[PDB]
């Protein structure tokens, strides 16, 4: 149902606010704007800072668009999901999303996948690519299939395959982790099938 989901009328701003960033579930260094549509990270030194969406998904196929300007990524820009227990702030620059049992992320600068990972040993996504041969553009789609229990991504039309599996049974929230002063990251929920 992904083709259909992506072809349907885009959710209006009220829907986007309902599924957008949660001012009550983000780093103390993040400011959520326009009722959830985007956030801005304050320029705190030696800090990685995350946000969760307001809604957690345990069933169905969900998709949302992340907008993350290329000049506002810095050393560690990670896009993915989290349980409600994943830490959203740490006092150093790192791939915080995906550093534990509670979170799954794609490093949109390096191409690596993180789950229970400190970085070393992380695989590349899409399969068989090298990070330095790709550039993740400003807009990417995040595709969470909680019927199959997969997370994957789509770019400029197009689904890149499952990145993570084994997610069925959990309740998972849109998430990112960021290190860049003043970065502005939009989440646009596209809906559920």
């Amino acid at each position: 149902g992904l083709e259909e989901l992506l072809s349907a009328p885009p959710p209006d701003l009220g829907a986007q606010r309902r599924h957008g960033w949660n001012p009550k579930d983000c780093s103390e260094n993040i400011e959520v704007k326009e009722g959830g549509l985007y956030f801005e990270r304050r320029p705190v030194a030696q800090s990685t800072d995350g946000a969760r969406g307001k809604r957690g998904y345990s069933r169905g196929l969900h998709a949302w668009e992340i907008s993350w300007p290329l000049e506002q990524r810095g050393t560690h820009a990670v896009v993915g999901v989290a349980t409600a227990l994943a830490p959203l702030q740490t006092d150093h620059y790192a791939a915080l999303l995906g550093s534990n049992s509670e979170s799954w992320g794609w490093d949109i600068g390096r191409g690596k996948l993180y789950h229970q990972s400190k970085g070393p040993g992380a695989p590349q996504y899409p399969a068989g690519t090298q990070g330095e041969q790709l550039e993740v553009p400003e807009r990417l789609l995040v595709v969470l299939d909680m019927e199959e229990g997969t997370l994957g991504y789509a770019i400029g039309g197009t689904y890149l395959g499952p990145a993570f599996r084994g997610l069925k049974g959990r309740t998972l929230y849109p998430a990112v982790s960021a290190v860049w002063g003043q970065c502005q990251v939009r989440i646009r929920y596209l809906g559920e099938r």
């Binding site: 320029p43 705190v44 030194a45 030696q46 800090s47 506002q72 810095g74 050393t75 620059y93 290190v179 860049w180 002063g181 003043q182 970065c183």
Partner: peptide, 9 residues
């Protein structure tokens, strides 16, 4: 006094 990652210095 000036950090990487566009953070305070």
């Amino acid at each position: 006094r000036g950090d990487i990652n566009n953070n305070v210095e």
